[PDB]
Amino acid sequence: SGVEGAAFQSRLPHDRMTSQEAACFPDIISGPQQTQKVFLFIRNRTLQLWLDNPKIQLTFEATLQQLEAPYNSDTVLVHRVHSYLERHGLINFGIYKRIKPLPTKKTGKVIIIGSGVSGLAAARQLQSFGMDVTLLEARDRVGGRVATFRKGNYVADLGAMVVTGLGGNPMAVVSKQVNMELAKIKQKCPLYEANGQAVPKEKDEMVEQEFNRLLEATSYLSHQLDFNVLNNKPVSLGQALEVVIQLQEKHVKDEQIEHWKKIVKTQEELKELLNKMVNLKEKIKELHQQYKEASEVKPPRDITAEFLVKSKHRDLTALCKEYDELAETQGKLEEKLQELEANPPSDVYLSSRDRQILDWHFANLEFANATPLSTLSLKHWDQDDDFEFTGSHLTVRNGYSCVPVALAEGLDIKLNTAVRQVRYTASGCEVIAVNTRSTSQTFIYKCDAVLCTLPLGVLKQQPPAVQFVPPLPEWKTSAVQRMGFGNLNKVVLCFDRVFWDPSVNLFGHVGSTTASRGELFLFWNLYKAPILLALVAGEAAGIMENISDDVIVGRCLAILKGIFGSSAVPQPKETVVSRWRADPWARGSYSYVAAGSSGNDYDLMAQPITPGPSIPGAPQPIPRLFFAGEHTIRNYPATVHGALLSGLREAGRIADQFLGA
Amino acid sequence: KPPKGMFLSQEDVEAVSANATAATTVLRQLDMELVSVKRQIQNIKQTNSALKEKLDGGIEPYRLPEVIQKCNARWTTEEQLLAVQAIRKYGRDFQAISDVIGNKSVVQVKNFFVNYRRRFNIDEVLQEWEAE
Ligand SMILES: Cc1cc2nc3c(=O)[nH]c(=O)nc-3n(C[C@H](O)[C@H](O)[C@H](O)COP(=O)(O)OP(=O)(O)OC[C@H]3O[C@@H](n4cnc5c(N)ncnc54)[C@H](O)[C@@H]3O)c2cc1C
Ligand SMILES: O=CCCc1cc(F)cc(F)c1OCc1ccccc1
């Protein structure tokens, strides 16, 4: 439906109020069911009006004129709902033409560290709300980990490049606001073994299915066998897959032993039967000799001599009957023994070729999580799964940077300004920063509040890139330690001509060892100009950063030559290699749910810091230091949309604190 | 509840995780275990192949022809004398006794046991059989 789709597109249950709405409308959620339904319709309809045209500001006055009775009768209720949606960034976020131009009386001063997407989204909101906002950016550009290479006609993304499903995704609204050339990613992805030959269709499917079953199995291992701690340490997805694979290899050997044991039991039953026959044959042989001697006593004979012939005769036919039955049983057993000898269970769980293809699927997962599987929390690594959007994944053909660049229009952004120190007190904050081009030029920024959107990699640095005075409390630094910050790199290859399959957006290279499974394992055809992207995932990410570009490009061309032929692959005209772990403004690619961590650490990351009183015995200070970024949003970590959402969240939180709700 | 064709018992999980090298040890002992079962199959195949070679010829040089005799009702003296000896040797095995005489049904043998019980000391004869 329509108002129902608006709720779904806003990641909201249409028939129930959220925790956040309860907080702002406690009178309604604690009240009768009828008013809750009126509220829910007002909310869903206001969302719909915004979504149905997100290029212009949805004002309260405009909203009321479009509501119909009975819902437009409590105008206080409508105004409250509208302002709630506006403040929390569910309507009038991103880039929209403003009806009422921004009032000149600016209230409050906020410094935002970082002008990636989270920092930018917050800044736009905070400006919309009337605050004075300045962003401090270390790099010479906006976007952070949204980073588009551009040279000539070549456009290729070194960071984020995929928009997940548009259903429920706030990037959908942004894509109606910015010219993004979104294109579906066809998921078909042929694999080529290390020798350049394609993986036959039978094997690609057998192993993908086994890969999926191995994952299920670890989840069984996690939930049903409570196998979550081993040797006093948290179990990882990697360990669990080892244990599952070891047990499938064990079951194959158990099945082999059971099989040959049925052969031994049967051979032995046959040995005992044969021994019974050679003895019976000898007994028959000797008895026949007796019958022969007795019947050669020519008649006329007395009746004992006759009894001897006739009873040896009878005794002999009985033994022959006994032997004929034992030979019928010998055929029944030589049957079982030949059927068994022809039904041997599987020889191996996975062949070497199998295991290598399986490793490509593991590398593909190491890609998705930007980390070796031995670091992923078995219990929690797929906790954001029940929030996946609906729809096809897409790429940004004109380069994802079009989004942060667009968001930056109109904001006060100081580029080439590396924050070194964040000072926060009961009376306000001071951010000390330097010019990255001459670190001696020092800058002091005084403000009411600091929104920190530094990447989790930067927060993790020892010794620190950015000092907090006073230091961050233990509950926050402990979260920063536990959370994973992973790594993932790309090689952009610009050719003058297309030698790959044009109707194929992905193809895989199957590395020959487990160790190297992440090394150039996947290639992307995403752009208009002939460009291939190559991924380095897992353990290979960090190791390939200490290898020169010329060698990395060399390894690529070697792989592609094997798949497409040596004559078909010219030298690239341009090449770029990302090194995200070494990037001091990133120190990795995105967060992952590490063993020993969990979803609650993402909440901890988002909790703002409140300084102590200046004067002792003085009233409780307000919070001064806020946090956003992909590492701060439990349900959508490690994404652009997750970062965007986290900025919208904090802007609402900051504005609630400094402008009043 | 594990996926079909996955095998994951609590028992086996602990056996493969209780130690740093538990897994490879477990699988090594199953490798040697399988080796010694295959070794044992080889010895029996060869033992049985030798036994089959002794049964070369079946029992065919030793099977007599199967004669049928019209089951007659009258007891010749010679047929009575065969029964008494067959009792002495086979006891109450009425079938074997019939097969020896040739032309006497199982029942006819049974009837013989009573009608000539007195005159042939059949009781003494059965006692005589039970000694050896
Ligand atoms: C290789 C790669 C592939 C990815 N692919 C997927 C994908 O395709 N789709 C997707 O949705 N997401 C993907 N992501 C994740 C996504 O890019 C990020 O989650 C998101 O862009 C990060 O946003 P953020 O605003 O939290 O952080 P950032 O964009 O990192 O912003 C923080 C900013 O702070 C700046 N900064 C750092 N230190 C200082 C300092 N001392 N002083 C001042 N400024 C400083 C940084 O330079 C940066 O501009 C990918 C990321 C990478 C790197
Ligand atoms: O290019 C960088 C990939 C960034 C990324 C990080 C995420 F945490 C979630 C994503 F959706 C995502 O991008 C698409 C993707 C989806 C599934 C598996 C792999 C990638």
Curated annotation (Swiss-Prot), chain A:
Induction: Down-regulated during neural differentiation in neuroblastoma cancer. There is a cross-link at K271, K298 (Glycyl lysine isopeptide (Lys-Gly) (interchain with G-Cter in SUMO2)). Ubiquitously expressed. Its cofactor is FAD. Keywords: Acetylation, Chromatin regulator, Chromosome, Coiled coil, Cushing syndrome, Developmental protein, Disease variant, FAD, Flavoprotein, Isopeptide bond, Nucleus, Oxidoreductase, Phosphoprotein, Repressor, Transcription, Transcription regulation, Ubl conjugation. The modification Phosphoserine is found at S440. There is a cross-link at K332 (Glycyl lysine isopeptide (Lys-Gly) (interchain with G-Cter in ubiquitin)). It catalyses: N(6),N(6)-dimethyl-L-lysyl(4)-[histone H3] + 2 A + 2 H2O = L-lysyl(4)-[histone H3] + 2 formaldehyde + 2 AH2. Disulfide bonds: none annotated. It comes from the Eukaryota. GO terms for cellular component: chromatin; chromosome, telomeric region; DNA repair complex; histone methyltransferase complex; nucleoplasm; nucleus; protein-containing complex; transcription regulator complex. Its EC number is 1.14.99.66. Transmembrane segments: none annotated. Residues 3-102 form the SWIRM domain. The keyword Oxidoreductase applies. It is found in: Nucleus; Chromosome. The SWIRM domain may act as an anchor site for a histone tail. It is linked to Cleft palate, psychomotor retardation, and distinctive facial features: A syndrome characterized by cleft palate, developmental delay, psychomotor retardation, and facial dysmorphic features including a prominent forehead, slightly arched eyebrows, elongated palpebral fissures, a wide nasal bridge, thin lips, and widely spaced teeth. Cleft palate is a congenital fissure of the soft and/or hard palate, due to faulty fusion. ACTH-independent macronodular adrenal hyperplasia 3: A form of macronodular adrenal hyperplasia, a rare adrenal defect characterized by multiple, bilateral, non-pigmented, benign, adrenocortical nodules. It results in excessive production of cortisol leading to ACTH-independent Cushing syndrome. Clinical manifestations of Cushing syndrome include facial and truncal obesity, abdominal striae, muscular weakness, osteoporosis, arterial hypertension, diabetes. AIMAH3 affected individuals have low fasting cortisol and ACTH, but excess cortisol is secreted after eating. Histone demethylase that can demethylate both 'Lys-4' (H3K4me) and 'Lys-9' (H3K9me) of histone H3, thereby acting as a coactivator or a corepressor, depending on the context. Acts by oxidizing the substrate by FAD to generate the corresponding imine that is subsequently hydrolyzed. Acts as a corepressor by mediating demethylation of H3K4me, a specific tag for epigenetic transcriptional activation. Demethylates both mono- (H3K4me1) and di-methylated (H3K4me2) H3K4me. May play a role in the repression of neuronal genes. This is Lysine-specific histone demethylase 1A.
Swiss-Prot record, chain B:
This is REST corepressor 1. The SANT domains may bridge the nucleosomal substrates and the demethylase KDM1A. Residues 1-73 are annotated as: Interaction with KDM1A. Belongs to the CoREST family. The chain holds residues 312 to 443 of 485 of the full protein. Ubiquitously expressed. It is found in: Nucleus. It comes from Homo sapiens. Essential component of the BHC complex, a corepressor complex that represses transcription of neuron-specific genes in non-neuronal cells. The BHC complex is recruited at RE1/NRSE sites by REST and acts by deacetylating and demethylating specific sites on histones, thereby acting as a chromatin modifier. In the BHC complex, it serves as a molecular beacon for the recruitment of molecular machinery, including MeCP2 and SUV39H1, that imposes silencing across a chromosomal interval. The lineage of its organism: Eukaryota, Metazoa, Chordata, Craniata, Vertebrata. Residues 23-58 form a coiled coil. The gene is RCOR1.
